[PDB]
Design an enzyme around this catalytic site. Structure first.
Site, PDB file in Angstrom:
ATOM      1  N   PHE A 255      16.994 -22.620  -6.766  1.00  0.00           N
ATOM      2  CA  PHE A 255      15.726 -22.228  -7.651  1.00  0.00           C
ATOM      3  C   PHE A 255      14.727 -21.662  -6.555  1.00  0.00           C
ATOM      4  CE2 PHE A 255      13.407 -22.646 -11.615  1.00  0.00           C
ATOM      5  CZ  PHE A 255      12.057 -22.617 -11.090  1.00  0.00           C
TER       6      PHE A 255
ATOM      7  N   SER B 191      25.925 -27.698   6.247  1.00  0.00           N
ATOM      8  CA  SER B 191      25.473 -28.734   5.575  1.00  0.00           C
ATOM      9  C   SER B 191      26.141 -28.918   4.188  1.00  0.00           C
ATOM     10  CB  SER B 191      23.733 -28.255   5.081  1.00  0.00           C
ATOM     11  OG  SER B 191      23.069 -28.095   6.299  1.00  0.00           O
TER      12      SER B 191
ATOM     13  N   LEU C 146       9.268 -16.433  -9.825  1.00  0.00           N
ATOM     14  CA  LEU C 146       8.886 -15.449  -8.790  1.00  0.00           C
ATOM     15  C   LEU C 146       8.951 -14.188  -9.685  1.00  0.00           C
ATOM     16  CD1 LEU C 146       8.710 -14.163  -5.987  1.00  0.00           C
ATOM     17  CD2 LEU C 146      11.117 -13.981  -5.849  1.00  0.00           C
TER      18      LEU C 146
ATOM     19  N   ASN D 279      21.274 -32.149   9.031  1.00  0.00           N
ATOM     20  CA  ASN D 279      21.557 -30.746   9.347  1.00  0.00           C
ATOM     21  C   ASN D 279      20.815 -30.011   8.536  1.00  0.00           C
ATOM     22  OD1 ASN D 279      23.477 -27.948   8.551  1.00  0.00           O
ATOM     23  ND2 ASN D 279      23.920 -28.918  10.975  1.00  0.00           N
TER      24      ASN D 279
ATOM     25  N   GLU E 249       7.200 -27.288  -8.118  1.00  0.00           N
ATOM     26  CA  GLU E 249       6.914 -25.807  -8.045  1.00  0.00           C
ATOM     27  C   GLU E 249       5.203 -25.846  -8.905  1.00  0.00           C
ATOM     28  OE1 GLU E 249       7.919 -23.536  -6.895  1.00  0.00           O
ATOM     29  OE2 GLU E 249      10.249 -23.958  -6.744  1.00  0.00           O
TER      30      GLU E 249
ATOM     31  N   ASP F 251       3.038 -17.312  -4.106  1.00  0.00           N
ATOM     32  CA  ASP F 251       4.033 -18.595  -3.641  1.00  0.00           C
ATOM     33  C   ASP F 251       3.807 -18.923  -2.000  1.00  0.00           C
ATOM     34  OD1 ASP F 251       7.285 -17.275  -3.743  1.00  0.00           O
ATOM     35  OD2 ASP F 251       5.734 -16.894  -2.067  1.00  0.00           O
TER      36      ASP F 251
END
Ligand SMILES: [Cl-]
Ligand SMILES: [Cl-]
Ligand SMILES: [K+]
Length: 164
Positions: free
Chosen positions: A104, A117, A32, A132, A11, A20
């Site tokens: 996150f 998945s 965010l 996957n 990040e 972002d």
């Protein structure tokens, strides 16, 4: 290596409001602020989050503070989501970090949508799960990051983050 260092790598750290990968106002370590296209709205969310009138700039400590809260919330979200908890509980520590990383970045809902998945992970079919996971908008829009996280689920090691 651990979840915080991991997400700190994925990040970055920016002390001024920025957009972002999706075009959304964010600050700090991937915190965010809002999906709104209004900067003012973002600034509002920022002051509320920090508890003061910031003018879109925060300090390192403040950023770390939101980051810690954000990591905690992510884990806590995993533990309260019936779709995610069992898988999370079935994994070893490294792989658990990979799942926290995804939550996150995209929200538990986002994550819970990787049903298939997720099921492969629970079955511990690592290679399969990794193939996957790649079939997703997530992988197409943020491929390098996705590759790192996928590598982590496939191997149970931090190889993709070592030397980064
Ligand atoms: Cl917050
Ligand atoms: Cl990326
Ligand atoms: K970021």
């Amino acid at each position: 290596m651990n979840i915080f260092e991991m997400l700190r790598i994925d990040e970055g750290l920016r002390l001024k409001i920025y957009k972002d990968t999706e075009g959304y106002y964010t600050i700090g370590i991937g915190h965010l602020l809002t999906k709104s296209p209004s900067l003012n709205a973002a600034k509002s969310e920022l002051d509320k989050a920090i508890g003061r009138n910031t003018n879109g700039v925060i300090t390192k400590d403040e950023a770390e503070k939101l980051f810690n809260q954000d990591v905690d919330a992510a884990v806590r979200g995993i533990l309260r989501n019936a779709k995610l908890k069992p898988v999370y509980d079935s994994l070893d520590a490294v792989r658990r970090a990979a799942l926290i990383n995804m939550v996150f970045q995209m929200g538990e809902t986002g994550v819970a949508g990787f049903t298939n998945s997720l099921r492969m992970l629970q079955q511990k079919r690592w290679d399969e799960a990794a193939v996957n996971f790649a079939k997703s908008r997530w992988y197409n829009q943020t491929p390098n990051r996705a590759k790192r996280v996928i590598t982590t689920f496939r191997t149970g090691t931090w190889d993709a983050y070592k030397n980064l």
